[PDB]
């Protein structure tokens, strides 16, 4: 019996009153539009935006901590080299804005050097992410922004085949170019590759030796959240799968890194975390389409002037529910992303990694996406600040959260009545 039930639960009586009143239903649908704009249309004030920015930054910061310590080398097939030095620019190396892959003889592989094949995948993803972060990530709803990315690497040493026409795609090793396209995010991304040889004895050449320089210019690279998350996934998965050998220089006093020496997939807790953050951010961004698909701005009411009937006139409700649920799911995942990395709830060696390295910057803060000779061994990806802004944004989403829940409950009531 229902009277006896609405005794025990006063709020359900109120919920039923609201559900049969178009003025209240329409008010809930307005709220849903406003909270959607908050989530997918804002940046600073959106928990969703902050949780995405945070996942991306954790991946980037992971490599700014460990890149410099990581071995790489060999030749183009992933095989050992006799005498190859391949230097990637705008990478966070020991006291340097480049990372040098010059480990010979050892077979590239697990607990070995990272292959140049893997380092190129890693590097491309990193250059794209640092360029996007530097420009600013758009709001989640903006899926057609692009960005332009440029990066260089050099090859030297006898037998080094990492910059040769065969690998590079270029016809002429000295002054040749190649344009190739590729279809990512349903979007055409143009790449321009150009090669150039500087001789051992040639005007302004510090490195006493002969080398080849490769330039990659990428236009039309999608900067949407889904796309940039796919880039961070490639970064952290390339590292985890290649699982190369690293060894570190711990500074005097500072913070202490454990272990010194080892392999990169050995940071299991940290990698799992970053992967989970990315996975939750991708799911969270996925809710954008559900929201878009179920717009809530058509006002609702009875048929033919006669009063609203919650049992027959409520076919909008499935869409209202789906929307409200999607919004709620964005908020919870956003929260979940933050709790995965927030050091308040971390323990042991994993907490020490986050508070002493990941959430740290050694740069003389400098803007996002900036690599300096002091970037190594520090995240330089605004991790403390992003955790803080996520929390701030959630705290300023108090009202909206309650409105989403109320909208979810109204719709749910109506879906029920309509069976």
């Amino acid at each position, epitope marked *: 019996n229902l009277s006896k039930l609405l005794t025990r639960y*006063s*709020t359900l009586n*109120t*919920l039923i009153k*609201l559900s049969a009143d178009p003025s209240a239903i329409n008010a809930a649908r307005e709220n849903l539009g406003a909270s959607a704009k908050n989530l997918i249309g804002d940046t600073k004030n959106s928990p969703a935006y902050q949780a995405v920015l945070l996942a991306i930054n954790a991946a980037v910061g992971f490599w700014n901590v460990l890149g410099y310590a990581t071995q790489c080398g060999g030749n183009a097939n992933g095989q050992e080299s006799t005498s190859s030095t391949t230097i990637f620019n705008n990478e966070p190396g020991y006291r340097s804005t480049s990372i040098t892959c010059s480990l010979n003889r050892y077979k590239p592989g697990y607990y070995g050097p990272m292959s140049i094949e893997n380092f190129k995948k890693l590097n491309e993803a990193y250059q794209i992410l640092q360029t996007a972060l530097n420009k600013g990530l758009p709001a989640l709803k903006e899926n057609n922004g692009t960005v332009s990315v440029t990066y260089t690497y050099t090859c030297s040493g006898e037998g080094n085949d990492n910059c040769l026409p065969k690998v590079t795609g270029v016809d002429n090793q000295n002054g040749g170019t190649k344009t190739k396209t590729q279809t990512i995010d349903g979007k055409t991304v143009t790449t321009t590759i150009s090669s150039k040889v500087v001789d051992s004895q040639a005007k302004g050449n510090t490195t006493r030796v002969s080398y080849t320089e490769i330039t990659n210019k990428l236009d039309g690279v999608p900067d949407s959240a889904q796309a940039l998350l796919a880039q961070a996934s490639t970064l952290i998965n390339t590292i985890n799968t290649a699982c190369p050998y690293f060894s570190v220089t711990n500074k005097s006093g500072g913070p202490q890194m454990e272990p010194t020496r080892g392999k990169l997939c050995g940071f299991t807790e940290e990698i799992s975390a970053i992967q989970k953050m990315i996975t939750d951010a991708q799911e969270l961004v996925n809710q954008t389409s559900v929201i878009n698909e179920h717009e809530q701005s058509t006002p609702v009411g009875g048929n033919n002037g006669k009063p609203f009937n919650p049992f027959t006139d409520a076919s909008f409700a499935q869409g209202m529910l789906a929307n409200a649920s999607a919004q*709620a799911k964005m*908020l*919870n995942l956003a*929260h979940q992303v*933050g*709790q995965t990395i*927030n050091p*308040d*709830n971390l323990t042991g060696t994993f907490k020490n990694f986050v508070t002493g390295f990941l959430a740290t910057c050694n740069n003389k803060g400098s803007p996002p996406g900036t690599v300096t000779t002091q970037t190594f061994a520090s995240g330089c990806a605004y991790v403390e600040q992003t955790i*803080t802004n996520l*929390n*701030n944004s*959630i*705290a*300023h*989403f*108090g*009202t909206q*959260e*309650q409105q989403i*829940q*109320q909208a979810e409950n109204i719709a749910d009531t109506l879906v029920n009545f309509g069976s």
Partner: nanobody
Amino acid sequence: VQLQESGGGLVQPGGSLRLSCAASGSIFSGNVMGWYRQAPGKLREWVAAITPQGVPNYADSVKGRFTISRDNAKNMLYLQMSSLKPEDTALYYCNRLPNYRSWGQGTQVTVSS
């Protein structure tokens, strides 16, 4: 996974009350926490929030009159209410933000006469 509010009562308009909330660590630690209230004939309304680092924010209905605070050593949340009006009459609840799906019993505040 525990929320236990206390401190409420019947008071005069003009009055003041201090509400307390014992939260478990699982809920409380590293989390934005807040106060809610559910008045007669209405659904639950958000009132105030506070980040782990201590930054508070308030609903327009209570800004200027209520202070929310947190004690991170003992997972306690507090709401100091001042200049109470009859309109503040409700059941008050703490939760984290975004909300844990099980609410505590709340504590009744009645402002009257």
